[PDB]
Amino acid sequence: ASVEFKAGVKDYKLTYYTPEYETLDTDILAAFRVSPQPGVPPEEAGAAVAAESSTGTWTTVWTDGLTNLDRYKGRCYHIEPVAGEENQYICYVAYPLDLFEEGSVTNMFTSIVGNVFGFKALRALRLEDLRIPVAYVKTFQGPPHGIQVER
Amino acid sequence: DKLNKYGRPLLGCTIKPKLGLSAKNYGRAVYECLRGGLDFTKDDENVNSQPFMRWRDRFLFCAEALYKAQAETGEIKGHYLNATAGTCEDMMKRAVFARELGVPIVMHDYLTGGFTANTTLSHYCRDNGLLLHIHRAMHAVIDRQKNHGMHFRVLAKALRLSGGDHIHSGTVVGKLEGERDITLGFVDLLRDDYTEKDRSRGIYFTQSWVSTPGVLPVASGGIHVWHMPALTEIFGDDSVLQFGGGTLGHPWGNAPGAVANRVALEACVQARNEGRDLAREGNTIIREATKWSPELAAACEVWKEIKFEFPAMDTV
Amino acid sequence: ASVEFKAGVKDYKLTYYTPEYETLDTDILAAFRVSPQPGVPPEEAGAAVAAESSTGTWTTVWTDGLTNLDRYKGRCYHIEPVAGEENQYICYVAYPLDLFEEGSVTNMFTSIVGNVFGFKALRALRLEDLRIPVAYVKTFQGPPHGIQVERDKLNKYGRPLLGCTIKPKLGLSAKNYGRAVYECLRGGLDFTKDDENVNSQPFMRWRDRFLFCAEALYKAQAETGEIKGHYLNATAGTCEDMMKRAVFARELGVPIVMHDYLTGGFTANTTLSHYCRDNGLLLHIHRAMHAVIDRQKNHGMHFRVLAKALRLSGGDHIHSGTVVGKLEGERDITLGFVDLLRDDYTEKDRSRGIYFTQSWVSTPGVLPVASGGIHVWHMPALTEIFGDDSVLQFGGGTLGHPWGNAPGAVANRVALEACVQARNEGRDLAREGNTIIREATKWSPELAAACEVWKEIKFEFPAMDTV
Amino acid sequence: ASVEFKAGVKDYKLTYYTPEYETLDTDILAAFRVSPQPGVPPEEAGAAVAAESSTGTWTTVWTDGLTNLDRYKGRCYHIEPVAGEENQYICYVAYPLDLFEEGSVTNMFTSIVGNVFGFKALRALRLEDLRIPVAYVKTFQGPPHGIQVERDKLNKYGRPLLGCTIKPKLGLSAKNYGRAVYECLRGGLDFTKDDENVNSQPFMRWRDRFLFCAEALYKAQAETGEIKGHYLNATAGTCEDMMKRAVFARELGVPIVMHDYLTGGFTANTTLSHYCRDNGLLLHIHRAMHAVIDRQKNHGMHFRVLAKALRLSGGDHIHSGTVVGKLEGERDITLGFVDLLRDDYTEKDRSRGIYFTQSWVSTPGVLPVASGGIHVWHMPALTEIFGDDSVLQFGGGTLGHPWGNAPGAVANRVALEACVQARNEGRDLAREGNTIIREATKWSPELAAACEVWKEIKFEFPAMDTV
Amino acid sequence: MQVWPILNLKKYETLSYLPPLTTDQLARQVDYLLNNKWVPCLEFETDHGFVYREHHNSPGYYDGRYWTMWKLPMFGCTDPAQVLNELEECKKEYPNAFIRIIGFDSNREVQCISFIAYKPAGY
Amino acid sequence: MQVWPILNLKKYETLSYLPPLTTDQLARQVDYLLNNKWVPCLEFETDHGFVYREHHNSPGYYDGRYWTMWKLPMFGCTDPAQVLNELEECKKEYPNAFIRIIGFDSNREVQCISFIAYKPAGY
């Protein structure tokens, strides 16, 4: 099942803000400290960050219809205000496991921190933490030795 | 000289959605874009090798696609194949297959991959005749705020030394931040052999390059047909203008999307060459072209009211 | 917690039978069909299996105290008696993620199936299924290409693919091999293949065969305008020889090679799978020797486990049985492992012998290959059972045609397309199968000739491996 | 002679049952235990097996006419009913030399054991023995060193060698592994070894283990003045990884490495065997997974066939069972394949399951390894059954000693030497075994402590694999 | 015994070995793809109707697999008449082109249907 | 929705997607070249109007990029009429060749202008 294609720009929140999404244990979760420009709703700014660090761009493209965007899209699933702070929020974004290259930190960062920090719609942006799922952790070698072996 | 392209900015396009397309669907999109008049298409920066599309498969289909477009149009085409990988060995493996395919260009995310890996690839591209497109993913993490970090102009100079044939420079008018005068400042620092100190453009020191080749600035990110006059005026012929959503978002598809961008660009070039003021007559020049170009008319209609205006964080 | 070392032997169940254990999503779960010797309680039998396949031995060792055994030990956490069998139980064992080497099917089987099958205390033992956690699945490359990519490379869609093993099995010369191949391919088949035992022998050396077969397939491709392939067998005595064969195939520019994964081995198969990924070669996997291991219900390893292992190690195709052909294969059990080979997720379903729910986290699917004793009349059944994502092979069914190889291929291609068309139009293949074939014989002389020869040929015998 | 091609299916026996055939000294002979489905005559069952394992398929193919089938076909030449079993027969099949690829055990099994075990027309099938002609034997390198050369390299003569598997199986760190190793070696054992499933895992990576184990073995060697070894496991997921492990062992200058030949596979085992020959490394072979294939009498492959295959592919040691330990092994059958592993010539002897006379044309002998659930009280029996040319391993039997590893080794070394001395002096080990051990306990406190702990431990269960 | 011909026997993959599809038969194939909720799309080619190898000869590389898209995939289409109408429109604009109908499955991202709906004269 | 044509749609780089240049439009392009003090030059080709690959397939290698020089670059030319006169001269002599006008910037040693000024019949 799929809908017709309609050229034109739509707000990112329409597709990327999913407050009722339950995260999967295979998802890479990110916690961003978002400071939107005045007039930009936190849901939109959170959606913009999720969208442009995963599968979306500024205008609607017909090619989305060739895939199942729902299983590949980044999703802003939760937003909470920062205490004692003016117009700042912590936006939580979930990224499906399929978006990342195995064993590559370079690829992980390219997606999550690639272009979103320079968005005109944001005053500032900080990545606070990342939940790396165990299924992704296993694709890396990790320390060549580690504490125990070193001692 | 290698591509036989002169007298106008080069045109590119990032395939969308960013992630999720299969290798064959990637090549299909590539062929349709290139056949409409775009010089290049490109892997999105985060498209490396993933479950939905492995790298070798993509390189293969994209090669078949670009050769088809080239034969159809009679103009040289290219598709920036992304060599960014987790290890130096993996990166090299991807550069090698590109060389075996006989393609003209590859790309690398110099900041997320790293300067050490980038310099290795730069040297390999020189030894094997491959053009190298550089994406500045992660730069805004470092250069956005005025009070702390490193300004992009320093990152730009670093790339010209490490090595790259193209580097994204911002669009000024697009979806990502970039002030006009600051941008003009580092574009000179990238292309010219000598740039004198100029505090109005954030240039603190006079810089000489002793004939180090210039790098082509790439304007990309949220731009469309109505921005053409402004982009041509700001950057000049020596630049690459890329339209991802601006091509794949066209109501008639990729080939017409490409035609619209190619026609809009050539209309601005012809007008400029005739002595027309792109700044003042920009909208008029585009409207004139829509009278004989259905492709362009359809595009202009869709993005007529779309602008990106917000206060800039990085300023002089 | 620490404890004083006490030398001596204790029952395995004191440490290895943990019926209150809740399995972690990172554990490898195993379902063993255990038949204990008289006098050995099922709890002890299950515990012995868990112990000797993970961390324990026959007597108490002091070294256990240097580590945290609770964290590494295999645990028999559930037991259930088997209905319709006496003194037989299904014992579930959990193994922590840490016990296994990343990306090595060889290491996985070494632990789970290593020494436990020979225990004096057991009459028989069979491994029915393994739950491979997603964290371990990600450590493998999987198929070098998989279903989607293969169809895309070959430009083939909307119907099962068609193959054929060249016969006789052994004895033909390189040139005669190419001759048979060209004739088969030009008539409509997508592929032809080396027989599993065709490697390099006095009557036909490998390089000569590869060369003559390349010429034949390119000629057939030019004549038909459809992409062709011929499974060149890279199975060899050493890793080095196997590699030299894969390399030449690459040099020829052909699309596919094959490997006998069980006789060649998992270590060599994994090496070849990685090479195929690196060089764009499709890899067809033949399961020679599997029945030695998987035919009896009371002892061995079920094929579904050997199938999952191939999906991990790597292979683009794998034989899956025919159900109706000359070799054993029950319909329900077959459909069960076919889903395990193609899908991304298969739910636990005991009516099909699926003991655990299995997720593949986007590992590419494997194309099941139905081959062995099948002919035109079997087409509707094969198409109905496997669907489009399958490869149907006719060796004797093509080279046994009275008019030769090309007409034999035509008969198979026509029979298939007639079924595809009928199905697409809404006809019931299981009900109107014979009628559909008969209708095509009216305009296809080639198919008519094939139908008359194999009209009374059926293969119906009681299956040994059932549920 | 030429004949007109006639399409259609004929019985396999018309071409493949040749009861008047006299076997050539160049043929590979096979003894199959065939159990046909009801209604299938033994001649047809035997013929189907011969056909589908050599040159034929299910229907007549015209291509047979391009070659000389009589020269290549496998032939069922003899059938005999099995006494004490119903509807079971021993069928002898002959395969010409030309059918096989030189030096490839992989190719040999692919033909003989490839697809025939899954035939619908058979209830069960078991390969009991293979007669490997001397002309084919010469195409293999065999063991990289063999019994004589090994004893000569290590400077050990006049008694069985002593080993020990480190426990627990999995879970120890690299440094703790070396610690256990040094303590075991210093007490008198010749070798220690990685458990078969110890490859490279989160708790202990291979290189760290190799390094710490090298330090430990050199220290124990310096302390005792006797040459020591530790089987470093090179079993891995790919040929490349396996090779990297063998290479480091070579760099360390250690004398021996090990490989799990069945889980690793014949192609990779043959590669490693050649490397060991080229670099002077002894190769210990572990038979993990064998019981999955060889335990039941009605279906599978007997171990003697898997043993002959190893002698060809290559291995200096191979586990052979203990008879008296925790894993199954009948005395007569065991002695049968032990001779097949060590000697240059073994005559047909059906009381020991030897179906064909086998000659090895000076291929080096393989050292049988008795391991699994054995302890001091078993010493006289082990020494009497295997003799000097064997390796006796005590894992739990060493690390389970109440005083630790060194005293455990001492107990084993003393128990062995006491048996050797007694035997040499003319005492009967089978009669005076317990007395001999008791005499040594009088002056060896270490042995006395071991004896009391394992006094009542026996492993007596009905065997499944019998004659 | 008939000898399978050699000349002018080019094929076009699925369904190409059956008698030419009639108007009604063609419509039934279109119904099928729509009933499975796949996305219909038309492709055409004038210069290279069959695969060839001009740019590379490595494993899996072939030229001629990509044809050109007629408009866009028909997302949301539920009427077979819509597809056949486009076939007629493509046919009139490109009478000397091979034209095929394909059907996409977005979830698996594979074409589940592909067949030649029209071929120029002399084919 | 129009489908972009596939046949006889060869292009000629800069300015080729615009309507054909009128006499005055062409003269204005020349004026632009001269105003920037770039050196004009005419190039023509009769056999390979488009890029191909016959002698090599390595990255960046293409045959057909070099055309043949009409006389010599017009050093010191300050009058467009001169350039337009040479163009006619070249046409009458090579009516079946493709002819393009290029403009060299000697300081950067890069061609800053390049457009097709004439095409033989059939294009």
Ligand SMILES: O=C(O)[C@@](O)(COP(=O)(O)O)[C@H](O)[C@H](O)COP(=O)(O)O
């Ligand atoms: O991912 C993206 O958003 C883009 O592909 C543009 O897509 P659209 O053409 O669809 O906008 C470019 O990489 C950005 O321009 C990067 O920014 P910068 O050039 O400033 O480094």
Ligand SMILES: O=C(O)[C@@](O)(COP(=O)(O)O)[C@H](O)[C@H](O)COP(=O)(O)O
């Ligand atoms: O040797 C053979 O018998 C075959 O070539 C079939 O020949 P025919 O097409 O001539 O029957 C196949 O390898 C078997 O199908 C393997 O069994 P499975 O597919 O069950 O692994």
Ligand SMILES: O=C(O)[C@@](O)(COP(=O)(O)O)[C@H](O)[C@H](O)COP(=O)(O)O
């Ligand atoms: O895992 C084990 O059980 C062992 O380490 C024995 O340990 P213990 O000495 O502690 O019993 C041996 O590998 C087995 O003997 C293998 O069986 P076989 O020798 O019959 O192949």
Ligand SMILES: [Mg+2]
């Ligand atoms: Mg991008």
Ligand SMILES: [Mg+2]
């Ligand atoms: Mg076969």
Ligand SMILES: [Mg+2]
């Ligand atoms: Mg062991």
